[PDB]
Amino acid sequence: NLKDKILGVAKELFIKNGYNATTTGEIVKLSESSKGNLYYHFKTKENLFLEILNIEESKWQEQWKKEQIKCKTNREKFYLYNELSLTTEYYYPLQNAIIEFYTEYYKTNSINEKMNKLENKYIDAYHVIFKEGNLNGEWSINDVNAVSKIAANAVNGIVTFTHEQNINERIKLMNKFSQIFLNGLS
Amino acid sequence: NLKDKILGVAKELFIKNGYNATTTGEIVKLSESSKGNLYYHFKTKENLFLEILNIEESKWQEQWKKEQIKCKTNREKFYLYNELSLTTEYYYPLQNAIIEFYTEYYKTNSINEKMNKLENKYIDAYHVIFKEGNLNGEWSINDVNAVSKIAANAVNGIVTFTHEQNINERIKLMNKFSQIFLNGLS
Ligand SMILES: CC[n+]1c(-c2ccccc2)c2cc(N)ccc2c2ccc(N)cc21
Ligand SMILES: Nc1ccc2cc3ccc(N)cc3nc2c1
Numbered sequence: 001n002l003k004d005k006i007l008g009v010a011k012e013l014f015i016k017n018g019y020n021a022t023t024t025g026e027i028v029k030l031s032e033s034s035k036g037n038l039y040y041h042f043k044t045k046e047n048l049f050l051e052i053l054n055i056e057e058s059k060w061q062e063q064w065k066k067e068q069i070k071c072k073t074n075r076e077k078f079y080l081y082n083e084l085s086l087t088t089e090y091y092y093p094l095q096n097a098i099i100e101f102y103t104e105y106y107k108t109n110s111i112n113e114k115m116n117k118l119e120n121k122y123i124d125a126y127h128v129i130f131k132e133g134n135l136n137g138e139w140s141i142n143d144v145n146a147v148s149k150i151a152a153n154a155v156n157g158i159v160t161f162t163h164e165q166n167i168n169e170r171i172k173l174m175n176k177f178s179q180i181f182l183n184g185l186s
Numbered sequence: 187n188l189k190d191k192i193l194g195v196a197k198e199l200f201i202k203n204g205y206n207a208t209t210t211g212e213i214v215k216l217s218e219s220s221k222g223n224l225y226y227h228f229k230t231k232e233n234l235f236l237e238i239l240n241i242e243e244s245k246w247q248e249q250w251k252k253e254q255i256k257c258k259t260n261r262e263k264f265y266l267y268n269e270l271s272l273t274t275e276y277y278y279p280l281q282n283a284i285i286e287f288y289t290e291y292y293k294t295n296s297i298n299e300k301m302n303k304l305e306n307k308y309i310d311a312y313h314v315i316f317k318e319g320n321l322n323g324e325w326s327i328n329d330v331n332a333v334s335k336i337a338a339n340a341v342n343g344i345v346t347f348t349h350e351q352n353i354n355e356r357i358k359l360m361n362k363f364s365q366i367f368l369n370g371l372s
Binding site: 018021096097099100102103106111112115119143146147149150152153154155156157158160161162163164172173176177179180181182183184185 | 282285286288289290292298302305329332333335336339340341342343344346347348349350358359362363365366367368369370371372
């Protein structure tokens with residue numbers, strides 16, 4: 001594909017290097033396509049990137065729907081979502097590239113904008129889990145949005161800043177966390 | 187001292203031009219030293235930078251040693267310390283050179299090894315709050331080292347991935363989080 005092989009080499013470059021480490025010269029070299037092509041659906045580098053973020057956030061949110069049935073209760077969905085977070089091939093592997101990118105465009109205006117419709121997909125998962133959990137007496141949480149946001153970020157932290165120690169310790173810690181967290185809501 | 191003048195000049199350069207832009211040539215000239223002396227004291231830019239980082243951790247440890255006096259109980263030191271990490275990174279100049287550096291040296295083992303004897307120092311603060319909290323029966327944690335690795339990374343997550351919200355909100359969340367986490371140990 002054309003408008004898609006671009007996004008493909010893109011996602012990869014952004015992961016295998018950094019947000020800046022990969023420049024348009026590169027995309028149009030490994031994806032092969034006149035600089036112009038990169039101008040339709042992608043009105044900028046921050047578009048090509050803020051684009052992939054949406055795909056990714058989606059591919060994951062979907063993989064999660066197709067894997068969350070293994071969780072009978074929400075207290076179980078909480079643990080599961082967090083544990084899966086550690087192993088997907090989606091979204092979470094671009095957290096570094098995002099940190100970077102948000103430190104080099106957070107000045108522009110449309111930065112804190114797209115980072116809204118996207119931030120809502122991101123904390124959705126927890127939102128559903130914590131809300132559906134009040135309807136299920138599992139716990140009682142007045143400020144759901146707060147907690148979703150907290151949990152989403154805490155988790156992303158555990159996932160991102162420990163991506164160096166053996167996968168089994170990572171999942172071990174993440175569970176102790178999910179454990180401590182939920183025990184804090186009741 | 188010529189060693190110290192190099193660390194000083196280099197810090198400033200990294201802060202103004204960033205990690206990538208600062209060459210060792212500049213560092214050598216502005217500190218009135220030589221490629222040889224620099225090589226002898228640090229070997230590489232990556233090492234130079236990690237040494238700056240080590241020194242920064244220390245000043246931060248010392249700063250904490252004084253600040254915590256404000257916090258009588260460890261429950262308090264926990265809340266406090268999390269708030270400090272939040273607010274202080276907000277206006278921490280090296281922060282950008284740091285991002286730029288980490289997301290560019292987490293594959294290498296040279297930079298992945300020393301980068302961890304460093305992270306360990308950050309984690310120790312929590313280690314202490316937690317160990318000491320046990321002896322005062324504020325809580326009872328049988329796995330202090332783990333709970334520590336968790337707090338450390340859960341917190342950076344909230345610090346690092348909430349940058350799009352206004353400061354009071356961020357601090358509101360961080361305190362809510364400290365509240366929940368501390369509650370799940372009870
Ligand atoms: C896992 C290390 N680590 C920390 C870090 C985490 C806990 C304590 C000290 C530093 C980090 C902290 C901030 N603010 C921003 C980016 C990074 C980062 C980025 C990439 C990477 N590969 C490791 C990274
Ligand atoms: N990797 C590192 C090393 C040392 C650090 C020292 C700091 C001092 C104050 C502050 N607000 C953030 C800091 N972050 C650091 C991150």
